[PDB]
């Protein structure tokens, strides 16, 4: 795709989220860069409204799959880059098992040479002392597969996957993800065969940062198609 050529080097990234979870209103700003040649993302997020009222790990998936590494032989399946620069809408329902849900609506597009992810997040039905509002999730992140299928009537894709957040007691908080993406612009976009994204993520803290924040290093490779 024409879109793919926008990702052959290092691309600056901005993330901006406004959220309301059970009436706790908050905002997050993030900055970093992506190098899709290596499936590589580095991002630092800051809660600009004070303390984040949900655990940072629960927002990782919401906070740019155009930075996935699609192997050359899978280039024709890369919807995300093909929608660029005009971008795509990315919507999800994230269902925390035995707890509340997030509904997210994001637009991912270029502003100049910078790839921007602007998100609105709404969370409802959370338990006041569940794992989310009670801040019982470990500050770490597991590796997951994102299963992608075409959504031809929307000129886009959908995805399903299961995120597992480690709980401080050693248990796991499941977050089921359902996802739909739709292109914003009028260029041709790629409608993929079934495949998945193999994701690994590492969370850290900036020792000099006293605002509430998260540093994310992530690697993503598309897979599941051999030819
Ligand atoms: Mg700012
Ligand atoms: Mg075929």
């Amino acid at each position: 795709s024409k879109g793919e050529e926008l990702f052959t080097g290092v691309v600056p990234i901005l993330v901006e989220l406004d959220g309301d979870v059970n009436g706790h209103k908050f905002s997050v700003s993030g900055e970093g860069e992506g190098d899709a040649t290596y499936g590589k993302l580095t991002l630092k997020f800051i809660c600009t409204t004070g303390k984040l009222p949900v655990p940072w790990p629960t927002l990782v998936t919401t906070f740019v799959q155009c930075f996935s590494r699609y192997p050359d032989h899978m280039k024709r399946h890369d919807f995300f880059k093909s929608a660029m620069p005009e971008g795509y809408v990315q919507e999800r329902t994230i269902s925390f098992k035995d707890d509340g849900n997030y509904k997210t609506r994001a637009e991912v597009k270029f502003e100049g040479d910078t790839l921007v992810n602007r998100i609105e997040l709404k969370g409802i039905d959370f338990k006041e002392d569940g794992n989310i509002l009670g801040h019982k999730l470990e500050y770490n992140y597991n590796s997951h597969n994102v299963y992608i299928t075409a959504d031809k009537q929307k000129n886009g894709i959908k995805a399903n996957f299961k995120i597992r957040h480690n709980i401080e007691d050693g248990s796991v908080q499941l977050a089921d993800h359902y996802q739909q993406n739709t292109p914003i612009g009028d260029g041709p976009v790629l409608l993929p065969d079934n495949h998945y994204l193999s994701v690994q993520s590492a969370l850290s803290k900036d020792p000099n940062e006293k605002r509430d924040h998260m540093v994310l290093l992530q690697f993503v490779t598309a897979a599941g198609i051999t030819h």
Side-chain angles (χ1 to χ4, degrees), residues 12 18 97 100 120 137 140 143 160 165 170 175 190:
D18 290 321
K97 183 170 185 60
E120 186 173 359
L137 301 181
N140 56 40
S143 298
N160 294 264
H165 297 297
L190 296 172

Side-chain angles (χ1 to χ4, degrees), residues 1-9 11 36 66 78-87 110 115 187-190:
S1 75
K2 188 174 176 181
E4 193 275 345
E5 296 172 35
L6 297 174
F7 291 90
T8 54
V11 176
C66 48
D78 186 351
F79 164 83
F80 306 103
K81 297 184 188 59
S82 81
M84 297 296 163
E86 297 84 4
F110 279 84
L115 188 284
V189 304
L190 296 172

Side-chain angles (χ1 to χ4, degrees), residues 26-47:
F26 60 100
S27 299
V28 173
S29 294
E31 300 179 23
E33 65 186 29
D35 200 354
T37 299
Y38 312 101
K40 183 180 187 166
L41 287 161
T42 313
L43 292 168
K44 174 179 173 185
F45 304 97
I46 305 162
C47 180

Side-chain angles (χ1 to χ4, degrees), residues 112-150:
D113 295 319
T114 300
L115 188 284
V116 175
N117 181 18
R118 288 179 175 94
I119 313 121
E120 186 173 359
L121 178 152
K122 187 62 168 294
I124 67 170
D125 294 330
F126 286 90
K127 296 180 177 171
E128 281 71 27
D129 196 50
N131 293 319
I132 291 83
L133 290 178
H135 295 277
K136 308 183 187 187
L137 301 181
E138 295 183 347
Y139 188 71
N140 56 40
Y141 214 85
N142 294 313
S143 298
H144 307 97
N145 295 328
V146 172
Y147 298 100
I148 294 177
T149 57

Side-chain angles (χ1 to χ4, degrees), residues 36-50 52-70:
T37 299
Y38 312 101
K40 183 180 187 166
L41 287 161
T42 313
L43 292 168
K44 174 179 173 185
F45 304 97
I46 305 162
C47 180
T48 61
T49 46
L52 192 71
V54 299
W56 283 106
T58 70
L59 300 182
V60 165
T61 55
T62 296
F63 296 148
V64 289
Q65 293 171 315
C66 48
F67 292 102
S68 303
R69 185 179 71 85
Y70 274 76

